[PDB]
């Protein structure tokens, strides 16, 4: 989720912020972009159970 | 140390000393094939060396061709019998 599209930074010199952008110029691949990935995606390897003697 | 030190090793039980473990007809097949083929060139060279009494040279040559000391000794013991004259 968030990483199926193609996006790369435009660099400095075009008067825009440096995040990755889709062809056309739309923001992507940031947690602060609409349609980007989570900063730290949830994962099923969280330890769900606990031990008791 | 490859064994565990304890006196009285083999004290409780009684071990089994199993039975430890030719073919003249195979010998006979060998005799016929030798009859119709002969020997190999390196074997002929070894025979000439043995006839000239250069035993250590024969061993060196056999080691160089065979790559194994026991097998080279067995080979020149085989060839001495046909090299004696």
């Amino acid at each position: 989720a968030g990483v199926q599209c193609t996006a790369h930074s435009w660099g400095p010199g075009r008067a825009v912020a440096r995040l990755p952008r889709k062809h056309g110029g739309i923001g992507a691949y940031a947690n602060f972009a609409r349609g980007g990935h989570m900063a730290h995606p949830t994962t099923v390897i969280r330890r769900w159970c606990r031990k008791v003697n | 140390p490859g064994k565990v030190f304890n006196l009285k090793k083999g004290g409780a039980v009684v071990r089994i000393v199993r039975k430890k473990e030719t073919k003249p007809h195979q010998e006979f097949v060998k005799s016929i094939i030798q009859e119709c083929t002969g020997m190999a060139p390196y074997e002929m060279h070894i025979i000439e060396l043995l006839r000239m009494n250069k035993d250590r040279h024969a061993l060196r040559y056999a080691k160089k061709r065979l790559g194994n000391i026991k097998r080279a000794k067995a080979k020149r013991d085989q060839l001495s019998v046909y090299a004696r004259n």
């Binding site: - | 140390p1 565990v4 030190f5 304890n6 009285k8 090793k9 409780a12």
Partner: protein, 148 residues
């Protein structure tokens, strides 16, 4: 639980305990254990003597159960006897009826001599003995035996 942790008491503080002059950057010292002989030598020498170099013979494959060797002291021999018969063995100390303890049955090989034994004769069967273990047992009137 996320709701009892230090990190959330830092909301509204910009930097989160990492400093304004220094800051939080990726790897300001390098990754892992690198630098132990150059720019971390003070740490490595203060806390880890004998971390660098070589020492002694090497074995290309160790036999774990050849080198295994359990041991028991003589202050433990009388606790292998169950609790309900020690009183009797102690009362009727006998040269003709003496308790026999076999320690390989309990999984020990050598017998060392820490401690002391009660004043009562006893046979002890092991696979090897230490000098003062023998001394103390033969001093209380016991006998050391070798077992297969």
């Amino acid at each position: 639980p996320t709701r009892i942790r230090k990190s959330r008491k830092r909301r509204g503080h910009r930097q989160m305990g990492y400093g304004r002059v220094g800051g939080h950057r990726k790897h300001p010292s390098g990754r892992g254990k690198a630098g132990g002989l150059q720019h971390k030598r003070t740490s490595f020498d203060k806390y880890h003597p004998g971390y660098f170099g070589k020492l002694g013979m090497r074995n290309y494959h160790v036999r774990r159960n050849i080198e295994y060797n359990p041991t028991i002291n003589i202050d433990k021999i009388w606790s292998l006897i169950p609790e309900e018969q020690r009183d009797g063995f102690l009362q009727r100390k006998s040269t003709t009826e003496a308790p026999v303890v076999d320690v390989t049955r309990f999984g020990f090989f050598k017998v060392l001599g820490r401690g002391s034994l009660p004043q009562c004769p006893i046979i002890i069967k092991a696979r090897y003995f230490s000098s003062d273990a023998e001394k103390k047992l033969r001093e209380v009137g016991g006998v050391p035996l070798l077992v297969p």
